[PDB]
């Protein structure tokens, strides 16, 4: 299958990404607390539902939440201000809370059931969010011996996610809070930070073939806008 590209609503961020977030890929956004990682996740959960000529993939969403940070109210706001029915947009987001990292890992196997089910409907799953990818792993695997063990568990978790992305033509979008020499297996890593005026600034990390520079946008009632 040819890959699809989900618009973020930010012109500069779309250009930085080569058109948008890719299916058959894992995109990791990382940055400090308050940088806007979960804002970007809420935004994408609405944008992906738009038809293709408007930058979406006419798709359904699955969302694994580890910090109780999913806000239906924010989905409602973004949908309303983009011409969409908020209740319909919410209906196409399938939501689960992960209790710990082991439950988080099992929920990837669980997600495959709904992915198969919707595969030939008019709104197949096109976006899978894990927010936060790493918070449970950071809490649970800690102290002497933990670096090797945590990296092995995360490697397996990310392989399971790569398989769903690649097998079912899905964009996987994950978040990671950072206050820096560990390995990462995401397809693309985006460093996000909050700068002056509350503007948000995004930079690609280790991505030579993608456009040099930084995207800059604001958090708004429509999600994000330049």
């Amino acid at each position: 299958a040819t890959i699809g590209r989900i618009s973020t609503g930010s012109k500069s961020l779309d250009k930085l990404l080569g058109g948008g977030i890719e299916t058959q890929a894992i995109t990791e956004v990382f940055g400090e607390f308050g940088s806007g990682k979960t804002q970007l996740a809420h935004t994408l959960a609405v944008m992906v539902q738009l038809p293709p000529e408007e930058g979406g993939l006419n798709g359904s969403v699955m969302w694994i939440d580890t910090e109780n940070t999913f806000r239906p109210e924010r989905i409602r706001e973004i949908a309303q201000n983009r011409g969409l029915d908020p209740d319909e947009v919410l209906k196409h987001i399938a939501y689960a809370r992960a209790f710990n990292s082991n439950h988080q890992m099992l929920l990837v196997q669980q997600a495959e059931d709904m992915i198969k089910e919707l595969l030939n409907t008019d709104r197949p799953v096109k976006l899978l969010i894990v927010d936060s990818l790493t918070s449970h792993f950071r809490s649970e695997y800690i102290g002497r011996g933990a670096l090797a063990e945590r990296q092995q568990k995360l490697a397996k978790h990310l392989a399971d996610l790569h398989r769903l992305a690649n097998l079912y033509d899905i964009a996987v979008f994950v978040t990671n809070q950072v206050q820096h020499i560990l390995a990462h297996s995401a397809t693309l890593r985006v460093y996000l930070r909050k700068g002056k005026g509350g503007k948000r600034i995004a930079r690609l990390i280790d991505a030579p073939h993608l456009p040099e520079g930084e995207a800059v946008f604001s958090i708004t009632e429509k999600g994000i806008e330049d």
């Binding site: 999913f70 989905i75 919410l90 209906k91 399938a94 689960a96």
Partner: peptide
């Protein structure tokens, strides 16, 4: 998973 449940609808949002």
């Amino acid at each position: 998973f449940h609808p949002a």
